[PDB]
Every structure is written in C-alpha cells, then in structure tokens.
Amino acid sequence: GSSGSSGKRKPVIHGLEDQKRIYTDWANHYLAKSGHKRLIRDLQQDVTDGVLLAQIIQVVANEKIEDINGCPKNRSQMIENIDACLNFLAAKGINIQGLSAEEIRNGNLKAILGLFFSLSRYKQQQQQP
C-alpha cells in the first residue's frame, strides 16, 4: 500500500530503509499504469527473480527484453533475469558498474536501492522537442 497526493513539502531525510519505499512507489506507478493489479510489497523481494523487476523496466523504458528467463526455477536461473536487466540498462546509458545480480537476488538493500537509484535517472531529464 502506497500513498500519492499533493500536500506539503518539507525537508526530510530518507535513510536506506526509507528509500526502499520511495522507489517502490516510483516503480509501482509504471506497473499500475499498465494495468498491473499486483504491486511491489518488498522492494528487496520484488527484484529477486528479475521478473517483476523487468515488468517495470520494459515499461518506463518502453522496450522488450528477450534476454529474460521469464520462469525462474533454479537459484542461478533467477540470476540471468536480473543480469539481463542490468546489461539492458547499461546500453541505455545507465551506470550499472558496482552492482551485483547475486546481491540483488539475495535482497541486499544496498544493492536493490542502487539499481532503482540509477534506473530512475535514465527517465529523469528526458525532454524531447
């Protein structure tokens, strides 16, 4: 459950744990908009298979990733998923260096956060005539 309205804006910090949310909403938007009932409950558990993760990228980016397993079963299979997303983003001009598909699969905040921290960038600053 995520809220979204136009109220008062004040200076406040969003610790690592706090960020996990901010991003969740940023993504969920791309999911719901595309008629996606299901939502992102645990950002750390929303990018462990790469499935739900790509469901957003392919949207915000408006592209399809054929390098996506689709149905992860093995501990490694899931990797390919997240991996494909990382390589797909890099080509778009998103700095992925430093991340680690493995870390993301485990649910390491520091990781997941880093992903949604760079991804959003790609979109931001997008003004075409």
From Swiss-Prot:
Residues 22-124 form the Calponin-homology (CH) domain. Belongs to the Nav/unc-53 family. It comes from Homo sapiens (Human). This is Neuron navigator 2. Highly expressed in the brain, kidney and liver. Also expressed in the thyroid, mammary gland, spinal cord, heart, placenta and lung. Abundantly expressed in colon cancers. Possesses 3' to 5' helicase activity and exonuclease activity. Involved in neuronal development, specifically in the development of different sensory organs. It comes from the Eukaryota. It is found in: Nucleus. Induction: By all-trans retinoic acid (ATRA). Up-regulated in colorectal carcinomas.
